[model samples]
Target chain A: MAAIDLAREYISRVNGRDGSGAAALFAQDGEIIAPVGRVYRGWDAIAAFIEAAPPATTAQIAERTMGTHRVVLHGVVQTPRFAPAQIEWIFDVDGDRIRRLTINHLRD
Target chain B: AMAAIDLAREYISRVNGRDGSGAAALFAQDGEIIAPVGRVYRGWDAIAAFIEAAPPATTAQIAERTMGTHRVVLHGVVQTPRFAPAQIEWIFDVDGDRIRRLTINHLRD
Candidate 1:
């Protein structure tokens, strides 16, 4: 799968509120770096993280930078728990799964 | 291996050529660009218009560039005939033979 496709799938799963589906897209030992710099690793932990979060969160992607194995997505995200905020997601894919994902909250 | 640098060089050359269409040709049909001021230009037509509207006699001088499989990061300075030179950073993402996205930012002094 293309890097962008993987990223899109992630967003789709998140919006669909399918925690298992979202977690399945990651590698067995994949890592996620949170906006505040916290790290979540492994499939179980990832799935738990998604499940623990509110399902009302939605990501509206505005721009994307797609490469062979990486995709950078810029957009606005809103969740039931927080106000809308501009965010950036960088996904580094290995094979058909995501190896590392870094999330950042943009100032603008 | 050579994808990033070659694409970067070609883009710089096309931009310096001062031909909006020529420069826009490097992008895919669905390509997008994020300008320094945070404006997003989508599609070929919008991107072409954005480039065409740029000031004449503006050119970029690349100071450093790092290449990856399909990503290139360039640090440079842009010189325009009417304004003082500005430091700039350009991030390019290439997919296949065309550019997927380009993000341009002005570096703080």
Candidate 2:
């Protein structure tokens, strides 16, 4: 899949509450860096990270910057616990699987 | 971040190569550049001249980058023959494939 395709798939899986499916899109050595800079490695770690998120959390993608093998996604993550917060997700793709993902929170 | 990576590479290479005309050509007809603190150069002619006016030995390296739909921000360190490496932030706004505006911010230590 293309970079954007992978990003969309991840988003779809997350929104569908399919943590395993989302984790499956990553490569064997893939990792996710949380907004606070915590790293979750491998499929098991990634799945656990997603599964730990609040069930009410949802992301609404607002914009995307697509590249050859990378993509930057901007959106708002909403949940009952907090107001909708703008965030960014940077995805680096390795072939059809995700290589690494970094989630960032907008800072003033 | 690789979004608009081609365009980003072109701009950086042109600047580092001291090809003012080439860099200016990447901008739209009415495009402008904001250099450092407050200097502004408008239109292709001014932009080209401003780029050409820089030190020939100047070069830069991209350390980090992020991109939005039509905008790209890059954090880099620029080096010149006379001064220590200075951290700078480049902000680019584009309309389609043409650059609409470019801003440079000199970061403090």
Candidate 3:
């Protein structure tokens, strides 16, 4: 898939709340660093984190576009009992798969 | 693209300078603000009010680093002669040519 398409798919998986689906987008040794300092390494680790954490509200991609091998996403993540937060995601892509993902969120 | 990021940086400069009107000009008509202090400010009018209510800056120095397309990471110090400096990280989200959202993180240290 194209870079933009991969990014859109990644967003869809997250918003859809599909841990496995989202995990599928990553490489075997891929990792995800969610906001709040949570770190998930590999598909198994990512799956475990998603299952243990409360479901995040659908993410809205306020802005995104291609940059080199990275797909930068600016959006919001609404959590239960907490104010919605501004979220930023930086994805490092290799071929059609994501090699690493870093997420940053504002505290409320 | 650089100009778009500059527009976002300009917003921070204006805010650190306590120029409410100047800061408000950088937003879109329906822009939303989520402050570092956990308050939500929506629209230009409320944003203006929030900006006005912010503690005035007696001294400020901002260093903005471009992260990637449509994103700029700002690391800076804001202070007054009488008060201690507050370290801050501001992330700007730019869409098209307007600022859609700004996420600020104020450090306790």
Candidate 1 chain A minimal-lDDT segment of 10 residues: A31-40
Worst lDDT run of 10 residues, candidate 2 chain B, spans B1-10
Supply DockQ values for each candidate: 0.05, 0.02, 0.08
Name the DockQ score for candidate 2: 0.02
**Model 2 spans with C-alpha error above 4 angstroms:** B1-109
Candidate 1 Cα lDDT to native: 0.76
- Against the true structure, what is every candidate's RMSD? 10.0, 10.1, 7.3
Q: Runs in model 3 with CA error above 4 Å?
A: A1-108, B81-83
What TM-score does the first chain of candidate 3 have? 0.82
TM-score of each: 0.53, 0.50, 0.51
Residue-level lDDT tens digits of model 2 in A1-108: 888989989988988778799999999989886744356889999999898887665466864779868898988778777777777787989889998886766431
Native A-B interface contacts kept, per candidate: 0.00, 0.00, 0.00
Best by TM-score: 1
lDDT of 1 by residue, B1-109 (tens): 3376677778877777766777787888888877743366778888878877866544456854678767788887777767688777777989887888887756545
Ranking by lDDT: 2, 1, 3
lDDT of 3 by residue, B1-109 (tens): 4366687667866876888877887887777676643355777898899889877763256776665566677777877667688786676777777777776656445
Q: Poorest 10 consecutive residues of model 1 chain B by lDDT?
A: B55-64
For candidate 1, write residues A1-108 as lDDT tens digits. 877889999888877878789889999988776633355788887877778766565566864778888888987777667778887888989899999876756665
TM-score of chain B of each: 0.86, 0.86, 0.81
